[PDB]
Design an enzyme around this catalytic site. Structure first.
Site, mmCIF file in Angstrom:
data_model
loop_
_atom_site.group_PDB
_atom_site.id
_atom_site.type_symbol
_atom_site.label_atom_id
_atom_site.label_comp_id
_atom_site.label_asym_id
_atom_site.label_seq_id
_atom_site.Cartn_x
_atom_site.Cartn_y
_atom_site.Cartn_z
ATOM 1 N N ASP A 1 -30.148 21.318 -44.721
ATOM 2 C CA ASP A 1 -30.413 20.966 -46.110
ATOM 3 C C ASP A 1 -29.748 21.908 -47.103
ATOM 4 O OD1 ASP A 1 -31.846 18.591 -45.980
ATOM 5 O OD2 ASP A 1 -33.762 19.609 -45.664
ATOM 6 N N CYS A 2 -29.203 23.032 -46.648
ATOM 7 C CA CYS A 2 -28.556 23.993 -47.526
ATOM 8 C C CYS A 2 -27.039 23.871 -47.532
ATOM 9 C CB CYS A 2 -28.963 25.417 -47.136
ATOM 10 S SG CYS A 2 -30.658 25.836 -47.581
#
Lengths: 811, 811
Positions: free
Chosen positions: A483-484
């Site tokens: 998600d980063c």
């Protein structure tokens, strides 16, 4: 550094010192009422929603840490102490804590007086029961006072901690007999209330925090406890609390027992009031009567123990390694069930104000708990599919409380749909129940748009097909599993979300991890398509899978490992040409698991590179080298200091994929070494470095670029338990569910002589004894079922409720 | 019960005991850097935004209360203490605190060692300066250690208190010389940082909270202070702090001085790094050099004192009542200026997570601070008008930082537009600057839709005209001035706003209080219309005002008092035929101030009814009787327990309107009695009952229906100061700005012999001596200006920068 030990016979972890490196917690509750309790009895409770139905107040990141909870004060002739050593922090003759399966025991002794408290949530009960035993172990008669204290919350936690300008004038309580009822806003719109009760006559009570504690006093020395007498205060706004006080006279060798209940009651609007201003207490009376004796509490405790034993009985391992036995048989499955029950709501690192969990996390947990609760897994799969959108995309955040997706967070995380196919395939392999494919499932929670489950799977499969990039690889979108890794954000402004803010059109950046996942899951999709009688659809799906495999081989391999991604500039991510982040971990496990590069040595080269560049004694880091500055084109990943979180931290969640990939190439020694580097039971000897709970997995461990290398964060709530259990129980130990039945294909260290697994599968029990006389790592030479040789490695399905002996000989 | 006293010569409040009934706070800062500091040095600082630029961490509703702040530890041969008595809470030989105008002094003595700290924010400085003086008052040579301590916040209070998943891995510091820099997220997207510095060589430092304090220790006994030695820890995630330690040797009678600075620095994006990973410190170096000696600190302190003296010099009162003099000359005006500087952002009851203040709140505050800062008042009026919508409605919440309205909260609070007209009229009466009417002002912050200020006033006036109800009275909408009177909500489900959720069309419910405001403000609107040369528009406006007056007389009077409202059913609110809430306070003050019922005795009857039914020794309650149950048709007002907040609590904000109305009917004794019942200086003798700051107003005081009758809530941040100052200085004392100049019309108690007011008005100074030889309450017999008797009660405008003596003889 050890702060306790394992009690395998009782299925407990015993903490022997109250000053652990961090407060170690446990969860109580199964269906609706939930509690977080630390080893010093700190924590709090709620009803199905830590955000909107919080019962007790807890302060995160407090000074001192972990202040507030179920606090018992023993007052003896001026002295006073606590059995949990907190919050008084006076030295005890003996202290002990035990975290079991759904219960917590805390024992403390001082001045010849011993106090033992058991906390647990009974099944089908909307309350926490605390059984207290007070024993005089001295040689003289004693006269003491017992104080019980909890601090109430105002239901809405965010409003409780932000809106003082209104809520300092709303707190309301009632006191009747030995029960203190919290009924804030019950007069206007809330049909629910809480209560704190004890099953004995009380000497006094307290419901106002300022009267019991004092404005300038802390939990360590409440003024009422210091004086040895209750104030009988009635709360009027400010902070409502609940405190009982009982005067107890104990002879030498005499003991007394008390039952305290923290209960939650929901009334109907028509029966809200006994009279004007007096709440209806019938349900509370019944709940209190349910557990007014020690015998009833013991019966409920035994019922909870039997329930938890039944939950863990479907996979049992007998081997020479007691650490492996305690991981596989007790703690991994317990963590999986707790994660299913709790989602991502409340921990000591999650503040409980979130609105739901990840869609991919919800799908991945099923892989871990499907063998324990198949029916609930089926229901959860249908609920997850009901939120899918018509184009095949999924909402990033799933809300189990309302069974709806989060519209504010949105969509466009292009790896999410494939997890639904993976979870459905896992469920079918576990149960053999193909009928779930024919269920009518709505799209976007709209009954008029309903289609079959297989249609949902087809749209999930073709969402990737219709969203390819210039190289033929899937478009990453806002983010993949990582998600980063935000390749379309390009943010320069603080307080701007890296996951929901995009400045690029998202038509260039690709993901190799999504490509590997697509190839890995398309096999199951093609099998399911073949089952449904759609041969042409299966052929087209196979053609797309072959195209993706060729695309990975042509544009996804860097020369010695698989590439990670392409950015919006079309530049390679995870390449030897890059200055930092020359290799990532996410693109190797799924590529090898998809059997890409198995024959030409590309998978072996990638795994050797992973060992060379990402391996630390505490696990495998995410990428190497770590990013030393901010990269605007990569998103949040470079915003961390090196070695922390996604900037070259250790995520055992993606270590499990490397373990499975090592099993794929037939290297069981490497797979087991990787498993051992991260398994909790194997790191309990370095607890002081780990600093977190030694009996459950944590999300992240600081990597080799960090100064705190080996330190963990975000424990008790992660998808790591499910994947690590799958890797150990199916890929290494070789007991794999499959469409036609149970497959045996172990990949074990070659020094092992053998082991035994008792598996409950599709209505039967298999006692599989694996033997390795020739000391190989992979390959099955012979399988015998009930004394008869079989062909292949798939066990027959009996569904007769009996036990069948299976002998596997490796070679 | 007294906990201190007033020092009028120094313009301070002196607190003599550290255990006040509640922590009493003060505000530091004028333009950008702001600090909240309690009498034990608790509180926190921020830069222009308590929500998005918080520098130091503070915990609200903590146990113990008010823990965390600028903490100084004196360590002497094993013993240790704090000058503020907190957080160590060891007994001191002497303690004292002083809250002044923009500064706070704290002095404490123990074991012959005295520590005096002065905290203030210098003008044009982005930091808090703390001057510390350490004195050996014993007879022996002493060797001590001084520790400083602050706890940093991660720039985002909500994220700081909810997002631990992240934030526990982001904290970063630098340590150079005697400065500790907090630079969390400076590496990615933040161009700003904070620092804590001391102007002397340090013997040690600490930047990690767990090393300075210890995990299981509190602020009362940090482990480093207990050991008498710093740990020199460097923060790596978790909780960054800043702490210096200096070893000091003092001879008997010797003293030492130190300067500590909490500073905030913003760098340009192109100039952010001295080198790779090293922040640029030139601005910090200059800031530290600015105040590296005591002489510079003293000069800045004198400059701040002169600034605050100039702010308060435009209205000076000389009377026989020292309490009245201290309220009028110092504390009311100070509170008005602080309210202007701080809006409604941060207090000990406002958590600092809000996004703005009320539109009507800003407009009402302007009436209080217009005579001190006319130019800033003009700018604020233009900014407020720029947010108005095209139909004449206003956003309920105004955000002073962005000068924009809050779109999420919305509109349809039908009293908001008239406050703009009232504030503009007040500004014009104060300054005589009619040119503000000709300014081009955008609508909804759109330059293409810009029109004149008078057009904004016209649309505000006609918003009420175009939104009348069946009785000819204004439609209340979501709410009038009373935000808890929601007649279109009909809410049943909890956790939904009473102010933004409406289940009704809003076409029946009317408000009498809005009608009174409309009649009261239409006079100023008609005057402004006449000034602009629009006679026909003025006549039409007068016709609408007359129609509203007739509507109030026909449907707004209950027989002995004015009605409050009509609900959605068309039933009377605030009527004698109602069982509860037979009379409200909001509909009487504005009706009498609008001069409705002066000739037939209706206003006198209403005021007598207010005295009979709403009067308590601590002020006037909102309505009588209090609501004993929930009323779905009334909204939030009935959701409170009786006597609290809007359910029959005491709001001195609307007590000021009753004071003005009592002046209107010529009863100065009643007006002054009402003023005295709520003025802080007159209630300092019952501080223990009041429990809050005895030098500033509070929003709410518990009414006669509450068990805590007389207890205050929500102090330091309210529109009460402005209205109460207006009532005392213009309506009672009779010095009123007006379009043609200064009007003299006192309404005073009959026993007063006279008084003097020095007023700075329109570029001149008026020294007005009022005499009452015949002992009347109202009426002026003679006015003499510069020895010459004038006609009327309007003073001539000189604008010559001189002093003119005015003699007023009552009769």
């Amino acid at each position: 550094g050890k702060f306790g030990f394992f009690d395998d016979a009782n299925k407990e972890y015993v903490i022997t010192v109250p000053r652990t490196p961090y407060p170690w917690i446990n969860y109580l509750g199964t269906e609706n009422f939930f509690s977080l309790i630390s080893n010093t009895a700190g924590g709090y409770s709620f009803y199905r929603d830590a955000r909107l139905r919080r019962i007790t107040r807890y302060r995160y990141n407090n000074v001192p840490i972990d202040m507030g909870g179920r606090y018992f004060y023993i007052y003896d002739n001026g002295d006073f102490w606590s059995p949990g050593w907190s919050p008084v922090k006076r030295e005890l003759e003996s202290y002990e804590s035990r975290h079991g399966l759904g219960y917590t025991k805390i024992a403390g002794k001082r001045n010849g007086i011993k106090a033992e408290v058991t906390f647990f949530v009974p099944l089908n009960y909307n309350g926490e029961v605390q059984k207290l035993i007070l024993k005089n172990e001295g040689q003289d008669k004693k006269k003491i006072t017992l104080f019980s204290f909890i601090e109430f919350s105002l239901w809405n936690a965010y409003d409780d901690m932000t809106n003082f300008q209104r809520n300092f004038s709303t707190g309301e309580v009632e006191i009747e007999g030995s029960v203190i009822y919290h009924k804030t806003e019950y007069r206007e719109r809330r049909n629910h209330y809480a209560f704190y009760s004890v099953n004995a006559k009380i000497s006094g009570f307290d419901s106002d925090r300022d009267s019991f504690i004092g404005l300038y006093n802390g939990f360590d020395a409440p003024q009422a406890v210091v004086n040895g007498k209750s104030n009988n205060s009635v709360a009027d706004g400010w902070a409502p609390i609940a405190s009982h006080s009982i005067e107890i006279e104990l002879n030498p060798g005499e003991q007394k027992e008390y039952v305290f209940i923290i209960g939650y009651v929901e009334n109907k609007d028509e029966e809200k009031w006994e009279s004007k201003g007096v709440i209806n207490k019938k349900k509370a009376y019944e709940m209190i009567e349910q557990f007014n004796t020690v015998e009833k509490v013991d019966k409920a405790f035994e019922e909870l123990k039997s329930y938890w034993n039944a939950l863990l009985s479907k996979y049992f391992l007998e081997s020479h390694d007691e650490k492996l036995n305690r991981m596989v048989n007790i703690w991994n499955q317990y963590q999986s069930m707790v994660t299913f029950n709790m989602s991502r709501s409340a921990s000591y690192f999650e503040s409980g104000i979130g609105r739901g969990m990840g869609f991919r996390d919800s799908n991945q947990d099923l892989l871990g708990f499907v063998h324990q609760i198949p029916e609930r897994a089926r229901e959860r799969l249908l609920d997850l599919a009901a939120t899918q959108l018509e184009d095949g995309s999924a909402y990033h955040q799933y809300q189990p409380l309302t069974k709806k997706g989060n519209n504010e967070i949105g969509s466009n995380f292009n790896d999410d749909p494939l997890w639904l196919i993976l979870a459905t395939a896992a469920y079918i392999k576990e149960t053999g129940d193909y009928s779930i494919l024919k269920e009518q499932v709505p799209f976007n929670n709209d009954p008029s748009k309903a289609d079959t489950m297989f249609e949902h799977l087809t749209r999930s499969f073709y969402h990737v097909v219709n969203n390819l990039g210039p190289h033929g690889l899937p478009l990453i979108g806002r983010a993949d599993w990582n998600d980063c890794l935000n390749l379309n954000c390009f943010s320069t402004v603080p307080d701007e979300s890296f996951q929901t803010t995009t400045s690029k059109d998202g038509k260039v950046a690709e993901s190799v991890m999504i490509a590997g996942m697509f190839v890995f899951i398309g096999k199951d999709y093609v099998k399911l398509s073949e089952y449904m009688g759609l041969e042409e659809e299966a052929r087209k799906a196979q053609q797309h899978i072959d195209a993706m495999k060729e695309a990975i081989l042509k544009y996804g391999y860097d020369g010695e490992w698989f590439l990670r991604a392409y950015d919006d500039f079309g530049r390679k991510v995870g390449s030897k040409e890059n200055e930092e982040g020359k290799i990532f971990i996410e693109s190797q496990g799924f590529s090898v698991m998809a059997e890409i590069g198995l024959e030409d040595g590309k998978a072996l080269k990638a795994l050797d590179s992973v060992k060379k560049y990402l391996d630390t004694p505490y696990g495998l880091v995410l990428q190497n080298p770590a990013f030393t500055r901010y990269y605007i084109e990569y998103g949040e990943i470079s915003t961390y200091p090196p070695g922390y979180k996604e900037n070259a931290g250790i995520f055992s969640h993606n270590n499990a994929w490397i373990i499975s990939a090592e099993t794929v190439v037939g290297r069981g020694d490497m797979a087991f070494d990787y498993y051992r580097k991260i398994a909790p039971a194997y790191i309990e000897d370095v607890s002081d470095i780990h600093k977190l709970e030694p009996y459950v997995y944590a999300q992240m461990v600081a990597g080799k670029d960090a100064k705190r290398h080996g330190e963990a964060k975000n424990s008790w709530l992660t998808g790591t338990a499910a994947w690590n259990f799958v890797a150990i129980s199916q890929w290494i130990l070789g007991v794999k569910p499959d469409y036609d039945g149970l497959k045996i294909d172990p990949s074990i260290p070659k020094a092992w002589d053998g082991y035994k697994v008792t598996r409950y599968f599709r209505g039967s029990t298999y006692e599989i004894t694996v033997k390795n006389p020739n000391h190989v790592s992979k390959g099955v030479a012979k399988i015998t079922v009930d004394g008869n040789e079989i062909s292949g490695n798939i066990l027959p399905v009996f569904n007769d409720g009996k036990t069948h002996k299976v002998e596997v000989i490796m070679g």
